Amino acid sequence: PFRDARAAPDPVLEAGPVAHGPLPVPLVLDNGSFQVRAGWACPGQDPGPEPRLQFRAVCARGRGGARGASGPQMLRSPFDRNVPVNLELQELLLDYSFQHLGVSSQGCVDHPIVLTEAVCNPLYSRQMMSELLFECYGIPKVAYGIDSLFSFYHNKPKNSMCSGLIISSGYQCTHVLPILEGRLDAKNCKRINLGGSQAAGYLQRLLQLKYPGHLAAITLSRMEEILHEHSYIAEDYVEELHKWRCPDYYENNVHKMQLPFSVFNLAAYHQLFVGTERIRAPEIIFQPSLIGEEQAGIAETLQYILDRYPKDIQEMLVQNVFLTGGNTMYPGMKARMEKELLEMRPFRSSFQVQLASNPVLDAWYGARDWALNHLDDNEVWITRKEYEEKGGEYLKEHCASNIYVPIRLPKQ
DNA sequence: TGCCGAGGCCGCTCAATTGGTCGTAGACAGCTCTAGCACCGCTTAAACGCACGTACGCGCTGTCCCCCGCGTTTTAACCGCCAAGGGGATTACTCCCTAGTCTCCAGGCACGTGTCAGATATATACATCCTGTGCATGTACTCGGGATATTG
Ligand SMILES: Nc1ncnc2c1ncn2[C@@H]1O[C@H](COP(=O)(O)OP(=O)(O)O)[C@@H](O)[C@H]1O
């Protein structure tokens, strides 16, 4: 039976939890598309004690017009396909986050910040995100990095130079990232235009067509439960669906999702039987052709990037296949990935598949551990004055960050 | 009996359709126009469409309560028929008049340009006309009783 989600927690703090040693403790801000995750670096403690503000990245303002609201509670959100592209709907998302974390007082946030961004970020987008940050909030110095690569940095066996493929899958994108000597080989990195949002959207539209008698009973927040709790990824889809074909297996494995009641009441207050549907929603990232979409999918793409290298460095970078982010949470994901990988390697060769320690939070914990180390490496950060000579389309090439290129944007 | 008378099958000859072959004449497809002026691309400052609670108007709804429907059959002539008669619609011919062709011939006017005006649009101020509302009676109605008209 379905549950309902929680809302409106009580995060309130003093003006700044400044510890011993250096006073400018940075904010660690994972600016996610599904949800934002934000908090103080809190140095000198091994386990990250409190990743506060776990909240959905969505805002309310309706037919009333005169007000808007920002916490977990018609709706809007600041992103287009995992790049932020909104003005004040970004501000009132930052404002919520700062106010609930506490801030000093004066006409700026006194603390430096580390902020996640898109695997590639359009130059205009980076420029705007820098302007909307330095101008309005007055931050002293800033760092941009990629969610996935922070999660890798967290999960590495050692704080040392590495190579691998990162497999990442968030709200509206999945990416395959080849990395060599700690550097993202962004020349031949690739992404797929699908993700967990689109899975839920498909599972919704399926069950709407299965039970037209009660369109209103099924809605995204209930699709979330069946997709998180009750769905799994096949080892081989055309074989799973084949064992699902016989009634004696079906009845033993179909999921009985009881709606809340007011004929045994199921003619409207149905038990929403999900069978094959609990496979067809996860599978979208491996076979986007279950939707209309003609793209290679996470299987053909991995082969298509992996055959663009010399045969020795393939055998190097496949030694660390890493799973992180959103959709990798499905049960069975490691097994499907390592089976699909076994067919596309030399007959006796070796590979290894690692799953992130906490697939959803390790991006933030990574950004924490990174900033807490690189406090004083002033070649890594963008300082407030640099933004006055370099127009905002500028970045500092540390590991776990997008590849910079010399370029400039006309503005007046 | 008879005879034959009446009787039942098969090549000429003509008269539409049908399809074929002859040759020749504009009219169709196409080219090059060429030429130019519309389509487009490129900006601009622009109007008007459109996605979106809430007051709330009325579309739809649960009751009882009766005529007109619903059912029958007698009959009543309506409608159908067939057969006969008369002509008038029809057919086939001969004489006849003009429909149609072409050709010459003119100027009527429909065509076209050449200028630029009285026209009507658009704004601002505005007063006024017109709508929506609220509000008495006056009639057009439904009924009952009797006179006149008309059917059988
Ligand atoms: N436990 C889970 N099982 C399955 N899917 C999950 C789970 N938790 C989150 N997701 C999916 O993860 C996606 C969001 O992941 P996230 O890393 O926050 O995205 P991003 O970094 O792009 O904002 C959502 O589409 C959601 O459906």
The letter for the amino acid at A362 is D
Give the Cα separation of A216 and A198 in Å (integer): 19
For residues A209-234, one letter each, b for 16 or more C-beta atoms within 10 angstroms of the residue's C-beta and e for the rest, the string is: eebeeeeebbeeebbebbbeeebebb
User: What token pair was written down for A244?
Assistant: 């699902």
Yes or no: say if A180 and A163 are a contact pair by the CB < 8 Å rule: yes
Could you say which DSSP state residue A69 is in?
B
Provide the CA A67 distance to its chain's centre, in angstroms: 29
Q: For nucleic chain B, give residues with Cβ below 7 angstroms from it.
A: A 62-63, 74
In the sheet that holds A54-56, the strands lie side by side as A54-56, A35-40, A27-30, A113-117, A141-146, A382-383
The letter for the amino acid at A160 is S
Alpha helices in A71-195 (DSSP H): 88-101, 123-137, 147-155
Q: Taking the C-alpha atoms of A328, A331, A335 and A340 in order, what is their torsion angle to the nearest 10 degrees?
A: -50
Yes or no: say if A4 and A334 are a contact pair by the CB < 8 Å rule: no
The letter for the amino acid at A134 is F
Nearest Cα neighbor of A120 from A355, A410, A393 is A393
| CA A354 / C1′ B116 distance in Å | 88
Pick left, alpha or beta for residue A8 (phi over 0 → left; psi -120 to 50 → alpha; otherwise beta): left
Could you say which DSSP state residue A67 is in?
-
Indicate if the alpha-carbon torsion angle A262, A267, A273, A276 is positive or negative.
negative
Give the Cα separation of A397 and A183 in Å (integer): 9
Of all protein residues, the one whose alpha carbon is nearest to atom 2 of ligand 1 is A228
In A273-383 the beta strands, taken as DSSP E runs, fall at: 321-324, 353-355, 382-383
Q: How far is the CA of A176 from the centre of ligand 1 (A)?
A: 17
Of all protein residues, the one whose alpha carbon is nearest to atom 3 of ligand 1 is A228
Reported for A377-384, long-range contacts at CB under 8 A and 24+ positions apart, including other chains, are A378/A141, A380/A143, A381/A112, A381/A141, A381/A142, A381/A143, A382/A130, A382/A141, A382/A142, A382/A143, A382/A144, A383/A140, A383/A141, A384/A134, A384/A138, A384/A139, A384/A140, A384/A141
Yes or no: say if A374 and A380 are a contact pair by the CB < 8 Å rule: yes
Nearest Cα neighbor of A290 from A356, A220, A201 is A201
Other Cβ atoms within 10 Å of A386 Cβ, number: 16
Give the Cα separation of A120 and A163 in Å (integer): 19
Helix, strand or coil, per DSSP, at residue A337: helix
Task: Please work out whether the CB of residue A326 comes within 6 Å of at least one atom of ligand 1.
Answer: yes
Give the Cα separation of A366 and A372 in Å (integer): 10
Could you say which DSSP state residue A381 is in?
S
Nearest Cα neighbor of A280 from A252, A244, A251 is A244
Rounded to 5 degrees, what are φ and ψ at A139? -60, 140
PDB experimental method: cryo-EM
Nearest Cα neighbor of A167 from A183, A144, A199, A190 is A190
Nearest Cα neighbor of A145 from A26, A30, A25 is A30
Of all protein residues, the one whose alpha carbon is nearest to atom 10 of ligand 1 is A326
Nearest Cα neighbor of A117 from A72, A149, A159, A165 is A149
Beta bridge partner(s), residue A354: A322
Cited resolution, angstroms? 3.4
Testing ligand 1's pocket by substitution, the residue of A203, A327, A364 carrying the most ligand atoms inside 8 A of its CB is: A327
Task: Please work out whether the CB of residue A40 comes within 6 Å of at least one atom of ligand 1.
Answer: no
